[PDB]
Amino acid sequence: MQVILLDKVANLGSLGDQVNVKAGYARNFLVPQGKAVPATKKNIEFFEARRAELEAKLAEVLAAANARAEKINALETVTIASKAGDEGKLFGSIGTRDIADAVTAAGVEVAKSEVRLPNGVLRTTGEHEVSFQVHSEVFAKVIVNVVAE
Template identity: 50%
Template sequence: MEVILLERVQNLGELGDKVRVKPGYGRNFLIPGKKAVPATPENIAMFEAKRAELEKVEAEAKAAAQARADKLGGIAVSLRVNTGAEGKLYGSVGPTEIVDALTAQGAEVEKREVQQPDGPIRMIGEYQVDVILHPDITVTVDVIVASEDEAEVSDDAAEASEDAAAE
């Protein structure tokens, strides 16, 4: 099946490319998602008439994604979670928790944009997570997962040192 791409599709092509794809991929993903249209003579003529408009929309989307990337650059997210022995988490840290933490810091990120290459986080430590804002724009965010128990221990130690200093 041949389709004309209406936007850049990763690992497939750019806006306006005429590509051959498997029929199921075209019918079930590209066409319903408005990412492509079948390559019929009518659609080719329609696309050529709207090419400038589609390129302008794509450029605006890329500029908006770049502005969001500039806001996200250098942000580190710190999450406090319940842990068991040896730093193993009860549950895991997934895209939802990362998005909530980024939103709390004022960043606009959707759950589908967060990519965890190694899957959900299940141990305390420092991790890097990719945020794909546009097919051409990816930002890496540092995620620091710490135990809530460590926070309580460090707070108790700080209070003890303040009490000792007061005496």
């Protein structure tokens, strides 16, 4: 039963992964639950059309984002206050969720996934340069100012 796995494959598989699975089992589970779609000339022409349309419609949100972020370097700093006292250090740390919620309160809609933060760097009170990941190909950075509270 050649079907197109769209859900679970590698995080996502809404591209075109045709695989022969169990017959009857897929028509009772995979399909009803919305996880895969049969691989039939009209359909392949319809779904593969989404691929072209995806790259065709694509960049307005990226081009506008980059230009929007470039404008931030004109507005500057994003002050964030947190408890501190350990000789410059804080008692805690500003995680990704705190950044996304703080940076958004500034005037930009950014998720936590877009906040590239390998390790909690925000531990001291001062000026830091956080890195962001708008896309696997597009990156950026923001200047944050940790204030002593």
